[PDB]
Amino acid sequence: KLMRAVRVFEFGGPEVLKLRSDIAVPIPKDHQVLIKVHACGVNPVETYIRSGTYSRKPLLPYTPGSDVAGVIEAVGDNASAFKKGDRVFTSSTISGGYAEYALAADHTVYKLPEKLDFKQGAAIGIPYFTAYRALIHSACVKAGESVLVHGASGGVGLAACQIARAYGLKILGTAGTEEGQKIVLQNGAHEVFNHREVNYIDKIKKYVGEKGIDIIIEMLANVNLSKDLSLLSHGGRVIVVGSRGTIEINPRDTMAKESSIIGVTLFSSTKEEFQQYAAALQAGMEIGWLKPVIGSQYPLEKVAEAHENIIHGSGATGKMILLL
């Protein structure tokens, strides 16, 4: 049995993402399951991996993608939590999610509540688990604190707005377009700003006044970190979620406020931590505040475009997904 899958044979630009229709369908064993993929999330980390310059360099060739949603097609003998026909989503796969079928370890697969479709299931894995770790673990947020989600219109950003809202925070978000701004306001933000405007930081400061902001969830630290330090309240923290370069800062900016700059990586989470996050996000999905938003959809054939556009495109309006 054969399938369509994206294969990378060598590292490089989006052009290295090959569509092949002659890829063997994996056969799950032991604790593995096989998922018939309906959609797969596109995460910016997949672009870094593909470029060959990220800290993870998979063995070539490989199929990209960690975040699928679909239906269990087959199970290994010990993958007792799942059966054929189960609607599921993932935070990892073994064989790669950019494919008609994906092999995954049973502990990186979760049931998909009936009220979320497969497109939404594909938005969950990295974005919502990352946002939850950043807020609950890294920032140790408390109800009533203020948060700025700096890059709120994409996958992690909207997830952060929804979690922050559920956990009782005062929420500011930024977006680069009018439509992105609108979506951010529909998903938890009390107030939104345009990060392409010359004076938007002034507008944020006018808005928060002298007390400043308790938490900043930063998607683009190489552009924003110094400005972030000026916005922090006394004892405030900026969580470095995303970063794509270097930045000049004044370390004195942390001193009088005793503020913190704190890095996060979802990959660093323990198994116990993932189980905690999964339980939190399942509760969100069933109560109904966890409602993933899909901003763009690409057929598998247009994977090079998807990669290009997630890094260089016009502006996010939610999660970008591949449709199978």
Ligand X SMILES: NC(=O)c1ccc[n+]([C@@H]2O[C@H](COP(=O)([O-])OP(=O)(O)OC[C@H]3O[C@@H](n4cnc5c(N)ncnc54)[C@H](OP(=O)(O)O)[C@@H]3O)[C@@H](O)[C@H]2O)c1
Residue 291, exposed/middle/buried by CB under 10 A (0-12, 13-18, 19+)?
Answer: middle
Query: What residues from 155 to 184 belong to the interface with ligand X (CB under 6 A)?
Result: 155-157, 174-177, 180
Q: Does 268 appear as a known binding residue?
A: no
- Between the alpha carbon of residue 106 and those of residues 169, 243, 253, 263, 289, the distances in Å are 34, 31, 46, 28, 26
Toward its own copies, which CB reaches closer, 203 or 234?
Answer: 234
Q: Among 177, 262, 297, 302, indicate the residue that binds its own copies (CB under 8 A).
A: 262
Q: Does 20 appear as a known binding residue?
A: no
The CB-of-1 to ligand X minimum distance in angstroms stands at 33
- Angle in degrees, 0-180, between the axes of helices 271-287 and 125-132, rounded to the nearest 10: 100
Identify any residues that bridge with 34 across adjacent strands, giving them in sequence order: 74, 103
Q: Does 151 bind ligand X (CB under 6 A)?
A: yes
CA–CA separation, 38 vs 40, rounded Å?
Answer: 7
Identify whether the C-beta of residue 90 lies closer than 8 Å to the C-beta of residue 48.
Answer: no
The CB-of-44 to its own copies minimum distance in angstroms stands at 13
* Rg of the chain taking only CA atoms, in angstroms: 20
Query: What residues from 217 to 256 belong to the interface with ligand X (CB under 6 A)?
Result: 219-220, 223-224, 241-242, 255
Q: Does 187 appear as a known binding residue?
A: no
Burial 100-127 (b: 16+ CB within 10 A, else e): bbbbbbbebbbbbbeebebbbbbbbbbb
Q: Among 245, 270, 272, 312, indicate the residue that binds its own copies (CB under 8 A).
A: 245
Q: Does 108 bind Cl ion (CB under 5 A)?
A: yes
The CB-of-17 to ligand X minimum distance in angstroms stands at 17
How far from the centroid of its chain's Cα atoms is residue 113's Cα? 19
Toward Cl ion, which CB reaches closer, 105 or 262?
Answer: 105
Q: Does 264 appear as a known binding residue?
A: yes
Q: Does 244 appear as a known binding residue?
A: yes
- Choose among its own copies, Cl ion, ligand X, none what residue 280 binds, the Cβ cut-off being 5 to 8 Å by kind: none
Q: Does 92 bind Cl ion (CB under 5 A)?
A: yes
Binding residues: 48, 153-156, 176, 195, 224, 241-244, 264-266
